[PDB]
């Protein structure tokens, strides 16, 4: 079971108003929206697994948006935006957030270590190069006679 709250912004199409009134009535928003939204949301959600809902949410929201738009259009409604808000379980949501927080932090730290390793490797090479050129320079400099080297 997944609890999701969909937020939708909508406006009627100005040209179709007479059709709206005839078919739906003045009450167009209350009668049509909840029905269509529940139907589409259920239909879309059914396709995806719970794990996907968490990672994939942007994809699901767009999918619901497109489907809802198509359905809404027949109603002569225009939807400016459709977004899923609050996907959850009571206790499970909290646990879910905690789990995500922890995993994210560990992953980032892992990258810290890798990055630092890279940095040290680079430092080692640069210093080796530096010493090398320093040696070359020193040797060339010695041209100020052997007393120089001594």
């Amino acid at each position: 079971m997944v609890n999701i709250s969909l937020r939708v912004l909508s406006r009627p199409n100005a040209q179709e108003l007479p059709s709206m009134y005839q078919r739906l009535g003045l009450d167009y928003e209350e009668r049509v929206l909840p029905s269509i939204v529940n139907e589409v949301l259920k239909s879309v959600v059914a396709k995806f697994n719970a794990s996907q809902l968490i990672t994939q949410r942007a994809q699901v929201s767009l999918l619901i948006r497109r489907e809802l738009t198509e359905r809404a259009k027949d109603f002569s409604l225009i939807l400016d935006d459709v977004a899923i808000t609050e996907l959850s379980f009571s206790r499970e949501y909290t646990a879910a957030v905690e789990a995500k927080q922890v995993a994210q932090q560990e992953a980032q730290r892992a990258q810290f270590l890798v990055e630092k390793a890279k940095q040290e490797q680079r430092q080692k090479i640069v210093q080796a190069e530096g010493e090398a050129e320093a040696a070359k320079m020193l040797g060339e400099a010695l041209s100020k006679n052997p007393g120089y080297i001594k």
Partner: protein, 163 residues
């Protein structure tokens, strides 16, 4: 001197006035870019009769937004988002010349055209921040290189000195 009911003077302001036109355009990368163009322009004094007859009193509102949006989108499409950050001056110039060319037809002269606030707003901070961090690290790397050179130099001089 005017004849009171017969003629009516329409006074236009020749002064340069700033106009900001916000435009949302896509870059070549298909990234959304919000740019507000700042335009300072004024009417050409000799053309006023023509402008009034053709476009009208409100010609600033009618012509400006259209041409500006058209040109800006056309220009922006050419470059990618990364170029927009580095290359900003070039883009502004190109927008300026093309805009001036177009504006001239209508009898408007543009004093200056400049891209202002390449965004979004969240983007202002994120972009600057990201660049800042990169810059700091890069420069520190610079310090490292310089310091290494200095130490190498010191070593050479010391050896010479001992010599």
């Amino acid at each position: 001197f005017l004849i009171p009911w017969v003629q009516k003077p329409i006074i236009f302001d020749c002064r340069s006035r700033p106009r900001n036109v916000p435009v949302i355009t896509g870059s070549k990368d298909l990234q959304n870019v919000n740019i507000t163009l700042r335009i300072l322009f004024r009417p050409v004094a000799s053309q006023l009769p023509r402008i009034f007859t053709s476009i009208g009193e409100d010609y600033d509102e009618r012509v400006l937004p259209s041409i500006t949006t058209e040109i800006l989108k056309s220009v922006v499409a050419r470059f990618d988002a990364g170029e927009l950050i580095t290359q900003r001056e070039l883009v502004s110039r190109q927008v300026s010349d093309d805009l001036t060319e177009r504006a001239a037809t209508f009898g408007l002269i543009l004093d200056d055209v400049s891209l202002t606030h390449l965004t979004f707003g969240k983007e202002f901070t994120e972009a600057v921040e990201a660049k800042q961090v990169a810059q700091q690290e890069a420069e520190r790397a610079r310090f490292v290189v310089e310091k290494a050179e200095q130490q190498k130099k010191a070593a050479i001089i010391s050896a010479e000195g001992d010599s």
